[PDB]
């Protein structure tokens, strides 16, 4: 029965960053985690899947583009090796999280935590014992779980992201339910390694959260690659017959049966809020079953905070990091800044070409009452894009006319995920298109296409 | 005879961008160019060499890293195809420059221009005639030429960048004189395609303009790749015997003879200031034989301007673009902003790993009297760098302590050239480490290593 200044529940990107920041500000800190050090992101999420996406990108060059680059010979690819490497990359970052806990003198507690009241946590230890832990403040960072198509269930041939990304062998065909970011990245990896792929989306666009021009471009690329995308289609039933799975879908009111060897459910994530005594601590849920928080990540209980995917605001790893810093600085009384409108935070999809965006789409800005100026620059006019061998996609910026303040930005192209930091820095600190248009960009880079769209917003695009 | 508001001499990155900007501001414009539309950059410089660097990067993956990525089979590479592609990329951008001239109603004049006085230009036409052209203002954008090792001369087996980049065949061995950016990129391409390469630098570091930590890292990578770099060595003589070239060098006062099939002279560039009547117009040269200019690119003659490599300030294509915009806005009387200290402008080297930098090195900032705070973050702590398969290099930021204003930045790693725009935007508009440290970066990207160094400058690096 020991006492800490701050206990952290869960050790993913939000939880372990918050604990470090609380250790930097002088608070005595403990972190409780039963399974994944590094949470979903480092163990079965962002990190391992980027390693697999890199492999898939090279298969797609060393086969589709071989003649163009002067590459000859019979080249084969082993997916087993790609899997072996993704697990070594993951293991290397988990070792990093343990080194960081040790460096900062954070007490790791290996177990599953449950609130006994507003200041007491009862932990069930992995080693078989029990531990009690009183605190002054607590940070809940327990993540989310996979949401299932209503009526269906998991089974041998119906799986979630976790069983797929840990499979060393591939199926002959697969149906992916959901055209979000995670679904498109599994489609992209599996199609490049010879799997027959179909993606079923309920909304009429793939990546329905992106600007409509971005959805149209990415649906064109995926069709070229050979993936079949069925939009405006509803999954009704999933039946696992052992040898194959029959997925019944409806579109335009007509029933249709698809078939594959596997089905991947990837329609979304529900916060984890059950089983660890949130009611004993008095913490209140929202109407969507998330933990409600204010702008400083504080729940309805004054000393309890909730960060990351468990509050549902925006379920990305860097958002969870930023929220944990706010939470920790708020507990210590240090200088902090709120994140603000979570629509302005960046996000990306890491198929090739990448998709990267922030802020409002053109249509969201018109519906909210701004005076909208749009500038669009294609990568066929970018010298670097031609040199790399992939000149597709574009840059599209949305701004307000009265001063030229940035409202959003939407990029599709080769590695565009790296080009967002200039844009979000200008939006957060109130730099206009006039200031941005004066920043000189190294030639030749993909980032020069940003400079061209800055000039377009002030009224004189030069190179297009 | 015919009169224009503005005549532009030379049609490279500076000249053709200035003409477009002068066309946008309402001035009637003519541009005189005998040979290269797009100048050195688009025809035999930046653009074609990036296409060759991309090819070399893929040879280096599909041979050195094949086993790690699960790539098997006998793979051969043809350098002839790489050359064919680099010439198709170049031709495609030259067609772009002509389309832009047509769109903006700029009069192209195909010939070599010579000043007759302060307002008259005599042009010798490629078609064989002569033309006279009076102007109100003139922009000189005539570029630079290769500088030769003192005492040596060009010949069959001793060449400059222009004859090398236009060679479809490769030599068995080559000695590159000069370890600047252009020399290292030719070394990198030729070594990956099986050429035996030696690079002789007079200064004691490779890339002597970079921060010493960047030079040490890049000399390690090149040694690993198999290139021999001789630093603090002086080229004395070059003798072309027909079958081989004997290069006599001295280091520590001891004479030594090297041998190769070819020698590439790549020690620098001298502005072009002879032969086209700069003395008839009254334009004054500096002591280094450049055209002198003030902060608005104006020569000692009130209506004549000089942009790009011909003024010698910083010989890069994007600098030439930025100067042409200033020049054109100054002639039209439009709102303009000077570029300022040219040391703050970004620059990059496009071998793999890239080198990217801006501003002052750590040692330059100490010698100039600042209170220097340094933050260094390695890419072995970057999750994305591990996923791509190249976790080498680092990020190093130099700042001033009193407010945390940025003084410089120095990056070596995979595609880091794209990460400079956030840094130069903060330096030009006076954003401190405190503001930068609040910008959220998409996870996982190479750019997160910037965010870590921002935290290091304000005193709390989290992930390392
Ligand atoms: C395939 C895939 C790819 C993704 N790719 C990206 C990407 O490229 N970029 C991106 O930004 N995001 C990506 N994500 C999302 C990212 O994984 C999550 O947004 C992130 O992990 C959320 O962080 P968190 O710490 O809030 O939650 P988690 O990472 O889920 O952390 C929760 C942790 O708390 C533990 N826990 C739960 N209950 C308790 C309890 N009672 N006591 C103790 N511990 C408990 C859990 O075991 C878990 O380890 C991806 C996700 C998936 C599935
Ligand atoms: C191999 C190589 C790689 C390079 N890579 C890069 C890179 O990655 N990034 C970068 O920023 N820079 C790079 N550079 C440098 C870049 O090419 C130059 O900085 C740039 O071209 C300078 O632009 P400019 O328009 O001032 O000169 P130029 O491009 O040389 O333009 C001068 C033009 O004027 C014409 N001209 C000359 N005299 C007259 C006259 N009397 N009348 C009419 N026309 C005339 C010439 O024919 C020529 O076409 C590279 C250079 C080389 C050689
Ligand atoms: C010095 C330098 C040179 C280049 S550039 O070499 O790429 N170039 C000359 C531009 C170009 O090509 N424009 C163009 C213009 C027209 C077209 C077209 C392309 O594509 C095919 C189609 N058509 C036309 C449009 O109706 C059909 C740069 N690009 C960027 C960026 N971003 C910065 C930059 C800086
Ligand atoms: C959520 C998340 C996760 C990761 S992370 O997965 O990469 N990770 C856990 C950090 C890490 O590994 N630190 C580390 C710590 C130690 C070490 C080491 C590495 O390398 C090998 C050597 N040693 C130690 C140092 O003495 C030997 C992130 N990195 C970035 C950036 N930039 C942002 C980011 C955000």
PDB file of C-alpha atoms in Angstrom, chain A residues 114-222:
ATOM      1  CA  UNK A 114      -9.378  -0.906 -10.981  1.00  0.00           C
ATOM      2  CA  UNK A 115     -10.637   2.122  -9.047  1.00  0.00           C
ATOM      3  CA  UNK A 116     -11.833   1.384  -5.521  1.00  0.00           C
ATOM      4  CA  UNK A 117     -12.880   4.989  -4.876  1.00  0.00           C
ATOM      5  CA  UNK A 118     -11.868   8.525  -5.888  1.00  0.00           C
ATOM      6  CA  UNK A 119      -8.322   8.166  -4.492  1.00  0.00           C
ATOM      7  CA  UNK A 120      -7.623   4.402  -4.273  1.00  0.00           C
ATOM      8  CA  UNK A 121      -6.604   2.011  -7.044  1.00  0.00           C
ATOM      9  CA  UNK A 122      -6.580  -1.771  -6.603  1.00  0.00           C
ATOM     10  CA  UNK A 123      -4.171  -3.525  -8.984  1.00  0.00           C
ATOM     11  CA  UNK A 124      -4.242  -7.210  -9.920  1.00  0.00           C
ATOM     12  CA  UNK A 125      -0.615  -8.114 -10.547  1.00  0.00           C
ATOM     13  CA  UNK A 126       0.494 -10.243 -13.480  1.00  0.00           C
ATOM     14  CA  UNK A 127       2.620 -12.194 -10.980  1.00  0.00           C
ATOM     15  CA  UNK A 128      -0.554 -13.203  -9.116  1.00  0.00           C
ATOM     16  CA  UNK A 129      -0.731 -10.857  -6.124  1.00  0.00           C
ATOM     17  CA  UNK A 130      -2.693  -7.715  -5.365  1.00  0.00           C
ATOM     18  CA  UNK A 131      -1.524  -4.171  -4.706  1.00  0.00           C
ATOM     19  CA  UNK A 132      -3.209  -1.020  -3.434  1.00  0.00           C
ATOM     20  CA  UNK A 133      -2.168   2.430  -4.615  1.00  0.00           C
ATOM     21  CA  UNK A 134      -3.437   5.763  -3.315  1.00  0.00           C
ATOM     22  CA  UNK A 135      -2.938   8.890  -5.383  1.00  0.00           C
ATOM     23  CA  UNK A 136      -3.570  12.617  -5.479  1.00  0.00           C
ATOM     24  CA  UNK A 137      -4.255  12.750  -9.229  1.00  0.00           C
ATOM     25  CA  UNK A 138      -4.858  10.048 -11.815  1.00  0.00           C
ATOM     26  CA  UNK A 139      -4.585  10.031 -15.604  1.00  0.00           C
ATOM     27  CA  UNK A 140      -6.788   7.548 -17.464  1.00  0.00           C
ATOM     28  CA  UNK A 141      -5.176   6.484 -20.740  1.00  0.00           C
ATOM     29  CA  UNK A 142      -6.840   3.132 -21.422  1.00  0.00           C
ATOM     30  CA  UNK A 143      -7.335   3.414 -25.204  1.00  0.00           C
ATOM     31  CA  UNK A 144     -10.105   1.896 -27.299  1.00  0.00           C
ATOM     32  CA  UNK A 145     -11.100  -1.445 -28.816  1.00  0.00           C
ATOM     33  CA  UNK A 146     -12.341  -2.590 -32.208  1.00  0.00           C
ATOM     34  CA  UNK A 147     -15.977  -1.967 -33.080  1.00  0.00           C
ATOM     35  CA  UNK A 148     -17.749  -4.842 -34.836  1.00  0.00           C
ATOM     36  CA  UNK A 149     -20.337  -4.730 -37.607  1.00  0.00           C
ATOM     37  CA  UNK A 150     -23.693  -4.964 -35.766  1.00  0.00           C
ATOM     38  CA  UNK A 151     -24.819  -8.575 -35.631  1.00  0.00           C
ATOM     39  CA  UNK A 152     -21.518 -10.210 -36.573  1.00  0.00           C
ATOM     40  CA  UNK A 153     -18.837 -11.877 -34.461  1.00  0.00           C
ATOM     41  CA  UNK A 154     -15.169 -12.755 -34.599  1.00  0.00           C
ATOM     42  CA  UNK A 155     -14.099 -16.283 -35.500  1.00  0.00           C
ATOM     43  CA  UNK A 156     -11.341 -18.198 -37.268  1.00  0.00           C
ATOM     44  CA  UNK A 157     -11.783 -16.440 -40.617  1.00  0.00           C
ATOM     45  CA  UNK A 158     -13.300 -13.179 -39.324  1.00  0.00           C
ATOM     46  CA  UNK A 159     -10.665 -11.094 -37.562  1.00  0.00           C
ATOM     47  CA  UNK A 160      -9.654  -7.620 -36.410  1.00  0.00           C
ATOM     48  CA  UNK A 161      -6.481  -5.654 -37.105  1.00  0.00           C
ATOM     49  CA  UNK A 162      -4.663  -7.409 -34.269  1.00  0.00           C
ATOM     50  CA  UNK A 163      -4.863 -10.964 -35.602  1.00  0.00           C
ATOM     51  CA  UNK A 164      -4.154  -9.858 -39.180  1.00  0.00           C
ATOM     52  CA  UNK A 165      -1.024  -7.832 -38.427  1.00  0.00           C
ATOM     53  CA  UNK A 166       0.313 -10.796 -36.409  1.00  0.00           C
ATOM     54  CA  UNK A 167      -0.244 -13.346 -39.208  1.00  0.00           C
ATOM     55  CA  UNK A 168       2.919 -14.542 -40.918  1.00  0.00           C
ATOM     56  CA  UNK A 169       0.913 -16.196 -43.732  1.00  0.00           C
ATOM     57  CA  UNK A 170      -1.395 -14.543 -46.242  1.00  0.00           C
ATOM     58  CA  UNK A 171      -4.840 -15.584 -47.522  1.00  0.00           C
ATOM     59  CA  UNK A 172      -5.815 -15.940 -51.161  1.00  0.00           C
ATOM     60  CA  UNK A 173      -8.612 -13.352 -50.932  1.00  0.00           C
ATOM     61  CA  UNK A 174      -9.918 -10.980 -48.270  1.00  0.00           C
ATOM     62  CA  UNK A 175     -12.863  -8.631 -47.765  1.00  0.00           C
ATOM     63  CA  UNK A 176     -12.087  -5.517 -45.708  1.00  0.00           C
ATOM     64  CA  UNK A 177     -15.105  -3.932 -44.013  1.00  0.00           C
ATOM     65  CA  UNK A 178     -14.434  -0.195 -43.772  1.00  0.00           C
ATOM     66  CA  UNK A 179     -12.591   2.303 -45.978  1.00  0.00           C
ATOM     67  CA  UNK A 180     -10.998   4.345 -43.222  1.00  0.00           C
ATOM     68  CA  UNK A 181      -7.267   4.863 -42.946  1.00  0.00           C
ATOM     69  CA  UNK A 182      -6.535   1.493 -41.351  1.00  0.00           C
ATOM     70  CA  UNK A 183      -8.547  -0.394 -43.953  1.00  0.00           C
ATOM     71  CA  UNK A 184      -6.837   1.254 -46.916  1.00  0.00           C
ATOM     72  CA  UNK A 185      -3.392   0.503 -45.523  1.00  0.00           C
ATOM     73  CA  UNK A 186      -4.155  -3.206 -45.125  1.00  0.00           C
ATOM     74  CA  UNK A 187      -5.600  -3.229 -48.628  1.00  0.00           C
ATOM     75  CA  UNK A 188      -2.439  -1.616 -49.981  1.00  0.00           C
ATOM     76  CA  UNK A 189      -0.075  -4.057 -48.246  1.00  0.00           C
ATOM     77  CA  UNK A 190      -2.052  -7.184 -49.127  1.00  0.00           C
ATOM     78  CA  UNK A 191      -2.715  -6.300 -52.771  1.00  0.00           C
ATOM     79  CA  UNK A 192       0.992  -5.695 -53.435  1.00  0.00           C
ATOM     80  CA  UNK A 193       1.770  -9.157 -51.993  1.00  0.00           C
ATOM     81  CA  UNK A 194      -0.652 -10.929 -54.318  1.00  0.00           C
ATOM     82  CA  UNK A 195      -3.843 -11.090 -52.254  1.00  0.00           C
ATOM     83  CA  UNK A 196      -7.197 -10.461 -53.938  1.00  0.00           C
ATOM     84  CA  UNK A 197      -8.761  -7.543 -52.059  1.00  0.00           C
ATOM     85  CA  UNK A 198     -12.219  -5.973 -51.753  1.00  0.00           C
ATOM     86  CA  UNK A 199     -13.075  -3.005 -49.522  1.00  0.00           C
ATOM     87  CA  UNK A 200     -16.695  -2.282 -48.542  1.00  0.00           C
ATOM     88  CA  UNK A 201     -17.536   1.259 -47.367  1.00  0.00           C
ATOM     89  CA  UNK A 202     -20.961   2.376 -46.165  1.00  0.00           C
ATOM     90  CA  UNK A 203     -20.431   6.012 -47.148  1.00  0.00           C
ATOM     91  CA  UNK A 204     -20.273   7.030 -50.829  1.00  0.00           C
ATOM     92  CA  UNK A 205     -16.545   7.921 -50.732  1.00  0.00           C
ATOM     93  CA  UNK A 206     -13.355   6.186 -49.658  1.00  0.00           C
ATOM     94  CA  UNK A 207     -11.705   8.067 -46.794  1.00  0.00           C
ATOM     95  CA  UNK A 208     -15.040   9.835 -46.186  1.00  0.00           C
ATOM     96  CA  UNK A 209     -13.384  12.237 -43.703  1.00  0.00           C
ATOM     97  CA  UNK A 210     -11.104  13.753 -46.366  1.00  0.00           C
ATOM     98  CA  UNK A 211     -11.882  16.503 -48.863  1.00  0.00           C
ATOM     99  CA  UNK A 212     -13.850  15.128 -51.812  1.00  0.00           C
ATOM    100  CA  UNK A 213     -11.006  15.870 -54.242  1.00  0.00           C
ATOM    101  CA  UNK A 214      -8.706  13.703 -52.108  1.00  0.00           C
ATOM    102  CA  UNK A 215     -11.188  10.811 -52.112  1.00  0.00           C
ATOM    103  CA  UNK A 216     -11.565  10.934 -55.889  1.00  0.00           C
ATOM    104  CA  UNK A 217      -7.792  10.832 -56.414  1.00  0.00           C
ATOM    105  CA  UNK A 218      -7.158   7.967 -53.981  1.00  0.00           C
ATOM    106  CA  UNK A 219     -10.018   5.880 -55.397  1.00  0.00           C
ATOM    107  CA  UNK A 220      -8.379   6.260 -58.816  1.00  0.00           C
ATOM    108  CA  UNK A 221      -4.968   5.098 -57.555  1.00  0.00           C
ATOM    109  CA  UNK A 222      -6.426   2.078 -55.762  1.00  0.00           C
TER     110      UNK A 222
END
